[PDB]
Amino acid sequence: LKSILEILSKSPDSYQKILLAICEQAAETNNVYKKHRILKIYHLFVSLLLKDIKSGLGGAWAFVLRDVIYTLIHYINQRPSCIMDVSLRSFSLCCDLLSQVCQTAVTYCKDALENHLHVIVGTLIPLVYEQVEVQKQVLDLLKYLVIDNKDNENLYITIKLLDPFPDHVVFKDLRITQQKIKYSRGPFSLLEEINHFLSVSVYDALPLTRLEGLKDLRRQLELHKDQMVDIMRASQDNPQDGIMVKLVVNLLQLSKMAINHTGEKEVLEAVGSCLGEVGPIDFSTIAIQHSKDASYTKALKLFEDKELQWTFIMLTYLNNTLVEDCVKVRSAAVTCLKNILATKTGHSFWEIYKMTTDPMLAYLQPFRTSPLSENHDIWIKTLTCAFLDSGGTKCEILQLLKPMCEVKTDFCQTVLPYLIHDILLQDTNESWRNLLSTHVQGFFTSCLRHFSQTSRSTTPANLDSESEHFFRCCLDKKSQRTMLAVVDYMRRQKRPSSGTIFNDAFWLDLNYLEVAKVAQSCAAHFTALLYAEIYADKKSMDDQEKRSLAETGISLQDLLLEIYRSIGEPDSLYGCSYHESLYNALQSLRDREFSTFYESLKYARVKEVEEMCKRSLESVYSLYPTLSRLQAIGELESIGELFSRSVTHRQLSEVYIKWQKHSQLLKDSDFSFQEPI
């Protein structure tokens, strides 16, 4: 019987059509009425039930997928109005899974025809006005260019046939520069002369390329991990001598100089994955040692302003909805989607639908949609002993903090939907787990007034002591202690007092060494100085109280001096294997006619990759040594050409003119900047 549904399923298709048309198309009519979102969730679960054997039943799986695609294409009228984002997410997931699982000598024609059907849909597109995520998925699909076959490249060209369409020039003028810069590879006919013409037209209609180039870099930053852009950007901008001149002119600004910082962040992204060329990608920036006056990193996600339109915890409701939207990967997240579908409780009709129509995300996210038992809280305060015992002193922080999640699932009966979502969400990863833990624990323990004075004043101190007493974790105790940020920012709402120090006294246990030593171990100067000043003020207040009534506090000045020494500022220090590298560099550069210049360049690349790996958190100063090393790499590249081709007329004179220009650019520097130079 299954063979007919597998292979002979051509007449059964019209048979099922006649079945659903027996009642005057009532089946598909009710499916459209119910938005068929539950049906698409069921289809996603069926697709997840797959992936057992790649071959064999893979043909039947592809047949079922093509039948679902056909039934989806059969009606295009109200599908874009009903649901597009979920379908785009499913298509992106299936396409990336295909690209990651496909290998040599596989039956690729089935997925090729599936991609052909997807492209046919994208070309039909009755609502031609496409959004930004469609172009994002297109750019992510166009990344596969190296190991593709000739037929695959022809199919990719047929896909790119959507580019020369001159309608709705907005997204074209936005992302054609990115589409062109994604062609950094060399062996090809470039296959997109029309896209290069479009890029040239975009760059020429606006006769300016310097600052809009950095603006295009900002527009590229919001893309995915793999970019392969910075090399070509540097090779195009560095020869332009006006960039550095206009930067020196505009040095009178105050901010917006984190281009290199964002590049380093993008390099730190996707380190454990493949494509380790991000090092050489970042090393192309030889126009450096001019972005200064930037102490450390800054904030992001400016959507917090629109987030603070609701006065109450509905801001945290919006944050939870954003997290739920972000959890969209694979299995154990379709359960999260079902939980989202289950969020239509009484609160959805009472308070959720107040201001969920004005913001941008609310234009497409919520319109798809639309009281439990009570216990006591004494056994949990009793089990806090074993909760503290299972605090730290063990590796595997994931299953070490999972008991913390099991303890926090104990519902503090103040707000229902928070506890409901905490109980329903038992499949997310450790990051979301720790975020929800911090948020829920903080808010509900601040709501608790009778049990916070006893448990929330002793258990956290014991936890900090056990975590600090020579038994720590692999950097995850920092994310654990990030609860202090919520304590200092969000938790200070209730218990209104004119004193933030008084709020911290009400909330925390008021330790003096279980936090300072943790900050010293984390090497984060922000919270270090914050808690240093807070504890100094608290010690002053305690001394005043003792005088009114009438380690060891005094030695903390030594720890403060150590902190000041760990910062690296001139007013804070005292105001209060490179030998072998040079040897091998000289050995590689001790012969004029020597082909080991590429070997020396590779050695320098490996050394700079090691330096980048050693430079963690991208917050310490003294990147200028590596900047001068990049300058030296460029100088060696120039010397490799000078030693070989100096014939016609004094090209070394022009090289020396360039050196004088570079020295004039580097006039805004000091000892620690020029001594390596």
Contact residues for another protein, defined by CB under 8 A: 1-2, 5, 11-12, 15-16, 19, 27, 30-31, 34, 38-39, 42-43, 46, 64, 67-68, 71
Instruction: Give the shortest CB-86-to-another protein separation in angstroms.
Output: 15
Which C-beta is closer to another protein: that of 43 or that of 328?
43
Among 181, 187, 193, 191, CA closest to 223: 181
Nearer to another protein, 28 or 611 (CB): 28
**Residue 638 and residue 586: Cα distance in Å, rounded?**
16
Tokens describing residue 660: 């004088």
d(CA 644, CA 12): 74
Nearer to another protein, 22 or 200 (CB): 22
CA 456 – CA 133 distance, rounded (Å): 45
Shortest approach of another protein to residue 344 CB, angstroms?
14
Query: What is the spatial distance between Cα 351 and Cα 432, in angstroms, rounded to a whole number?
Result: 24
Question: Of 67 and 140, which CB lies nearer to another protein in the complex structure?
Answer: 67
Residue 109 has phi, psi (to 5 degrees) of: -70, -35
Q: Provide long-range contacts, Cβ within 8 A and 24+ apart, for 78-85.
A: 78/32, 80/126, 80/127, 82/32, 82/35, 82/36, 82/37, 82/368, 83/35, 83/37, 83/40, 83/368, 84/131, 84/364, 85/133, 85/364, 85/365
Q: Least Å distance between CB 22 and another protein? A: 9
Nearer to another protein, 1 or 274 (CB): 1
Rounded to a whole number of angstroms, the minimum distance from the CB of residue 16 to another protein is: 7
Q: Which is nearer to another protein, 15 or 129 (CB)?
A: 15
Give whichever of 4 and 573 is closer to another protein, judged by the CB atom. 4
Beta carbons of 534 and 504 less than 8 angstroms apart? yes
The answer for residues whose C-beta is within 8 angstroms of residue 333's C-beta and 6 or more apart is 327, 427, 428
Q: How far is the CB of 5 from another protein (least distance, A)?
A: 5
- 551 token code pair: 């380690």
Q: Nearest approach, Cβ of 334 to another protein (angstroms)? A: 14
Of 478, 469, 324, the residue nearest 397 (C-alpha): 478
Q: Helices 85-101 and 37-48 meet at what angle, rounded to 10?
A: 10
CB of 95 within 8 A of CB of 141?
Answer: yes
Closest distance of CB 11 from another protein, Å: 8
Q: Shortest approach of another protein to residue 64 CB, angstroms?
A: 6
Q: CB-wise, 91 or 624, nearer to another protein?
A: 91
